[PDB]
Design a binder for this molecule. Structure first.
Ligand SMILES: O[C@@H]1[C@@H](O)[C@H](O[C@@H]2CO[C@@H](O[C@@H]3CO[C@H](O)[C@H](O)[C@H]3O)[C@H](O)[C@H]2O)OC[C@H]1O
Length: 189
């Protein structure tokens, strides 16, 4: 179990962030593996990957993902200039994060159609401090907890729709939770 923060573990970048509410434990394992155990958490996001990411990375993930409540399993990252938080959502719990969001297209990648959306965060935490910024989403129709994500198909489809990314910051496979419980064990490569 570790301190919220960022760093390197067994050759992989990792980021673990939480809102301080309690109820979540995050552990880095061998190679690209990480685990999350949570019970009546607050908001948190953690996982392993790269710093910086790239715009054509093929990201592999495998393992188990057992949310009980509001949680996502995604390729997750940021761009700077413009500041964007992005999600390629492979699975989720009780809440589809695109609920109520305006659909901006579709993309077929890695065995499923994904629906594309843009949302906005207003005065929220970010990699550069409190800010207002857009979020980009690709939400997989066919849920899974292992697979391969060709990020270029998503970033290209987003750009085509007017959802442009700046310079890549970190890029991870992440478990996110919002006031929920669950367990997950995921290996990245
Ligand atoms: O000390 C600061 C870190 O705490 C900071 O971390 C980022 C803060 O913002 C998080 O994004 C939220 C996570 O949850 C959802 O998805 C929300 O929309 C986001 O607001 C990032 O995950 C953290 O990496 O980095 C800056 C550092 O100075």
């Amino acid at each position: 179990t570790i301190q919220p923060g960022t760093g390197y573990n067994n050759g992989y970048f990792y980021s673990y962030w939480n809102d301080g509410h309690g109820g979540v434990t995050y552990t880095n394992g061998p190679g690209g593996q990480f685990s999350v155990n949570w019970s009546n958490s607050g908001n948190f996001v953690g996982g392993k990957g790269w710093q910086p990411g790239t715009k054509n990375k093929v990201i592999n993930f495998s393992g188990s993902y057992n949310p009980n409540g509001n949680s996502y399993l995604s390729v997750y990252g940021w761009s700077r200039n413009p500041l964007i938080e992005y999600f390629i959502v492979e699975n989720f719990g009780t809440y589809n994060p695109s609920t109520g969001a305006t659909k901006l297209g579709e993309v077929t990648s890695d065995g499923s159609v994904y629906d594309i959306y843009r949302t906005q965060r207003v005065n929220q935490p970010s990699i550069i401090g409190t800010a207002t910024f857009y979020q980009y989403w690709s939400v997989r129709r066919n849920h899974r907890s292992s697979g391969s994500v060709n990020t270029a198909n998503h970033f290209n489809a987003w750009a085509q729709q007017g959802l442009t990314l700046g310079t890549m910051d970190y890029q991870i496979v992440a478990v996110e939770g919002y006031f929920s419980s669950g367990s997950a064990s995921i290996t990245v490569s």
